[PDB]
Design a protein around this nucleic acid. Structure first.
Length: 135
RNA sequence: CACCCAUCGAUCGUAAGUGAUGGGACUGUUCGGGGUGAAAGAUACGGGAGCGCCAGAGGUGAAAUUCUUAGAUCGCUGCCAG
């Protein structure tokens, strides 16, 4: 099933792409965000714990979410990319460009593109003491 | 310009320095995350409610302890606290 509109129109959902260093969410929802349509993570497409953030897992996840959002009736995506943000890291993880390419090549039209990494006007004490994650 | 009358007071008088690119005080005037009192704000971390969705999420060199179909993580809008 799907929505009904005139011939020359595009149904726009919003695709939140959560690209942290440990996983990768691809999350297609209604423009409100209130109604999830389909979300797939990089950990649903691989066996190893490592590959949850691999560029291949994010590709397969954004694929398998694009096919289902087409099944539902969504044709274009306003894209909202996100890193862990807050205090962790404002740099988007590896499986972000691969999710973008997956959606674009798969066939979803791409509207706006955005960065919604949570950032602080000022922040709570970051994890790891004064000396940080000594390695 | 030493005086002239109109019309306002008419205290009795400085004579032992000068006023440091010394100091202090004053006036004016910036300037500044200087101090302190009281409201308001901002996202973010966390929890919580409502609404979706379903199989993982978190974490790592790799894992595991940890959370999770009894609905975790994720998404949206209020809410609470620091």
């Amino acid at each position: 099933y799907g929505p009904q509109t005139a011939a020359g129109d595009l149904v726009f959902g919003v695709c939140h792409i959560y690209a942290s260093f440990n996983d990768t969410f691809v999350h297609v929802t209604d423009i409100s965000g209130r109604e999830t349509i389909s979300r797939v993570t990089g950990g649903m497409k691989v066996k190893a714990d490592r590959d949850e953030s691999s560029p291949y897992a994010a590709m397969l996840a954004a694929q398998d979410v694009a096919e289902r959002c087409k099944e539902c009736g969504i044709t274009a995506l306003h894209i909202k990319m996100r890193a862990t943000g807050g205090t962790r890291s404002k740099q988007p993880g590896p499986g972000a460009q691969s999710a973008l390419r997956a959606l674009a090549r798969s066939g979803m039209k791409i509207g706006r593109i955005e960065d919604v990494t949570p950032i602080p006007t000022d922040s709570t004490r970051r994890k790891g003491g004064r000396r940080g994650r000594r390695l």
